[PDB]
Amino acid sequence: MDDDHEQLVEELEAVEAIYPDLLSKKQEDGSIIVVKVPQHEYMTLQISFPTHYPSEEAPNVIEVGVCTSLAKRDLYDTKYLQHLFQEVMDSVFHRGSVCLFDFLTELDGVLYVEPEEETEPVQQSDIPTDPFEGWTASDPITDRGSTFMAFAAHVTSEEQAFAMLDLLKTDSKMRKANHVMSAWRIKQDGSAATYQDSDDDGETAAGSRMLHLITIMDVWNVIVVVARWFGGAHIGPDRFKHINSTAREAVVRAGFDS
DSSP: OOOOHHHHHHHHHHHHHHTTTTEEESSSSSSSEEEEETOOOOOOEEEEEETTTTSSSOOEEEEOOOOOOOTSTTTOOOOHHHHHHHHHGEEEEEEEESSSHHHHHHHHHSSSOEEEEEEEOOOOOOOOOOOOSEEEEEEEOOSSEEEEEEEEEOOOOOHHHHHHHHHHHHOTTTTTSSSEEOOOOBBOOOSSSBOOOOSSOOOHHHHHHHHHHHHTTOOOOOEEEEEEOOOSSSSSSHHHHHHHHHHHHIIIIIIIIO
């Protein structure tokens, strides 16, 4: 009777994070959902969320459905699976867990079907999503097959910019791209001690262009590095647009739009 929705809506976004396509919500936010066996089966679980949701008690297993042939249709029925489903909820009925995480455990054993006993996730990605020291980078964008990306960093006098950019350019992870371009700029807020130098390592046409680019963009005292990578066809629909919004915040934040 306090933040029951927040935790509820959070488990939704959490199960989403773990398994998107696998879960299907009948209702907009929580209330009623249909999850399908994590093995990507065909037996879908119809579950509702009563006024006494996880916090109060637990969700409500309303029904189960399954796409089956005449091979194992005699072994289990929908109402039958519903019975064991319920006895499993009994587990996720008095735990600090909401349901989804703990109940899959029992289902994992009772439903059987065990392929292997190991885990292999996907952690291979060129596109940077992790933070950097001194550096604030978060703008990877997508193009046909290619990937675009930029790293911004607020800086002080020339030593700072020189070192952090030196290092970054000679860094083997940034070294992995097709062509990288960089631009640094230092302008005294209200003084004359300014240090500026050009670049052209990757593509030379981008060197002076990027320089005047940061000039016309109304921005100083901050550095930016752009890199081009090759990936899949479009890498992912959620890659460019969604990160664009996030990236937009970073670039602006690091002092690109003050």
